[PDB]
Amino acid sequence: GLPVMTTPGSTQFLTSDDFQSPSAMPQFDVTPEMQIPGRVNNLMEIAEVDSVVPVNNTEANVNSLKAYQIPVQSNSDNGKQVFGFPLQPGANGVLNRTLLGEILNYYTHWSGSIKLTFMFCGSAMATGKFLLAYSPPGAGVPKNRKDAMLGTHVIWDVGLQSSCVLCVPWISQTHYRYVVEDEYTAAGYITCWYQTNIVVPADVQSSCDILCFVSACNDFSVRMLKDTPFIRQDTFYQ
């Protein structure tokens, strides 16, 4: 009769406990293993994969592939904004449903850099230049290309390359930021501007489209696992 004293927490079922349990099927000969391609070991392996971003969330475009199309056109203006969304990968609609955002919504905290790949799907004869800028928080969303000029930005020439990667760095007061919207964990604003108007020849379409892809860089991690708010249930599906 070994003397023992039960401590608080006994006869307790903690969802996230990691104890050993007696097997109900002793000596069960499991089927051997097979080398199935594409083994995943971490959900960051998924979050690091580029996925198309629905930048054009317009009510009418959201239920169509028009959601993913960023319109650009040959203009008479000089520095017209192309698009602008906040850097809320897990909260704002522009990114919350991306691959990255879908993974983020299972965790509470996030930290790291972000790849924004922009692919120009216009005619081979079209050219132009764009200013892709990430403005950290504290100020307002840049209202002019001049305002955006003062933050981390990139001049993307369409003529030479069709794809261009803006790598948004992790510039934050804290080591992590909340996946959910909190001003404290502000993120910034990502804008695009016309650096040089899209010049097209005769008999070529002057209005083209751009696709945006989001992924995580090698320095991205998540924390405080939770349930996603995207899935809902009223009764057991049958």
């Binding site: 199935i36 594409g38 592939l65 959601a67 449903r97 799907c121 081979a124 696709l211």
Partner: protein
């Protein structure tokens, strides 16, 4: 330029064009370690592992997309299909080459993806789609730009923005894929390995893969530019194995 040669066939695929090798795996033959079928397989080699060019389809300014089930796409193509009928179990990789060429004055972008186990949903939530609706032998079945109604008991909910799988169409990039941007692209080449939970499976009852070609940026072109842009799919079995010889099948 480079030459991809499989048996009697040879493709010309740019020179810098990236061949996307599935999940990093090059198709290979089954190993004695992972097998259970005791009968010696048939490896047709040159007769089966070759480039079958399926039907071409027309890309028009409103096209929503196309898809093929793979085992049921090469079912009527040559000795691959013959062995497919005569054997109970099969195992295959693929080399998929989707070709589309326009001119400098054209524009557009296709997503070419390989979805393993592309189980699709129905229009009537109380039924599963019919065999003909899911399957089109070398006859691409088309995605739709609109929801199909509850009416039509046995059809596939072909709304493109859900890919008929209840997901965000913009997330299909997790599956091995390429983009054909007419600005800078002429073709897409994907080498898919054998993807399945079991070492071998029947080739009529189970479509292990599903090719999807979805235009994300629609075709457009000025007046005068050629208005008929076809897309031609050419698939080649790779390291094909068959076990369980028997009578053919009426399938």
């Amino acid at each position: 330029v480079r030459s991809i040669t499989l048996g009697n066939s040879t493709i010309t695929t740019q020179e810098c064009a990236n061949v996307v090798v599935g999940y990093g795996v090059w198709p290979e033959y089954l190993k004695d370690n992972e097998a259970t079928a005791e009968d010696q397989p048939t490896q047709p080699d040159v007769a089966t592992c070759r480039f079958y060019t399926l039907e071409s389809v027309q890309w028009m300014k409103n096209s929503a997309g196309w898809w093929w089930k793979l085992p049921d796409a090469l079912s009527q193509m040559g000795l691959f299909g013959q062995n497919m009928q005569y054997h109970y179990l099969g195992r295959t990789g693929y080399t998929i080459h989707v070709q589309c060429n326009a001119s400098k004055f054209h524009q557009g972008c296709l997503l070419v993806v390989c979805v393993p186990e592309a189980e699709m949903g129905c229009s009537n939530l109380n039924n599963t789609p019919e065999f003909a609706e899911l399957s089109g032998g070398d006859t691409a079945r088309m995605f739709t730009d609109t929801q199909i109604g509850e009416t039509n008991s046995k059809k596939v909910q072909t709304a493109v923005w859900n890919a008929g799988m209840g997901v965000g169409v913009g997330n299909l990039t997790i599956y091995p894929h390429q983009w054909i941007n007419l600005r800078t692209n002429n073709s897409a080449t994907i080498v898919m390995p054998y993807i399945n939970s079991v070492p071998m499976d029947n080739m009529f009852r189970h479509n292990n893969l599903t090719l999807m070609i979805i235009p994300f940026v629609p075709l457009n072109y000025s007046e005068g530019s050629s208005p008929y842009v076809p897309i031609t799919v050419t698939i080649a079995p790779m390291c094909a194995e068959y076990n369980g010889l028997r009578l053919a099948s009426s399938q």
